[PDB]
Amino acid sequence: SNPYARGPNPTAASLEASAGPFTVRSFTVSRPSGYGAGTVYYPTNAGGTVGAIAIVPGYTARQSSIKWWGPRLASHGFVVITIDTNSTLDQPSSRSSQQMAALRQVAELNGTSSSPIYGKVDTARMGVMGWSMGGGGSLISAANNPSLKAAAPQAPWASSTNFSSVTVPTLIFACENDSIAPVNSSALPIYDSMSRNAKQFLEICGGSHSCANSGNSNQALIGKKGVAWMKRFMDNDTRYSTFACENPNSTRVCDFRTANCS
Structure with a gap:
């Protein structure tokens, strides 16, 4: 059996809902280690240790832009840290450095008896998410860090689109009408460069650059896919294989591609 499986058997309805099965609490990191600020979201009744995910905003942006992912993912059985960068004008490499520093601090807090997440994290199972340059990061x-178990960036931007070295299962959320990091010059070339991993490309019909941010009109689909991807690859949870690998057959998706998934 799978030692990392948490929660009940998933359904389309349970994955599309605003909240998953677990109760969520949060705290602000009092002394951020290698990044600007952070909020940690965690389940109080997951029934076992869970993996950790660090989420980074875009250029000029703050935690508010990606906050919705905190409760959404945590309610399904993950410890999630949303960060502000040292500067709102940090570039993708620095954003990556800060994202990994936030994961390191979540691991440190797992071993800190005063922390609300003491003993709640499996520090060997981690994931990365982020918007725009934070997606590039x-x-x-x-x-x-190929030991990372999953990546799910949204509307990514990066100096180069060559990510051919990536072996981590990667889901790319794209926004059809993105005028900041256009799909044909950023998200889709990034996707096409990856030849050694489980990968997926999900383009939201009519979406602006902020189409997967807090307040978006597609939280049912986007949240379903994000949680399913993290569940399948961070938890090795084959109960989520279809939700993770399937073409959603949704009127909200204008482009879908997947490879080496199922």
């Missing part, structure tokens, strides 16, 4: 983190 997530891909850099995956390329440099």
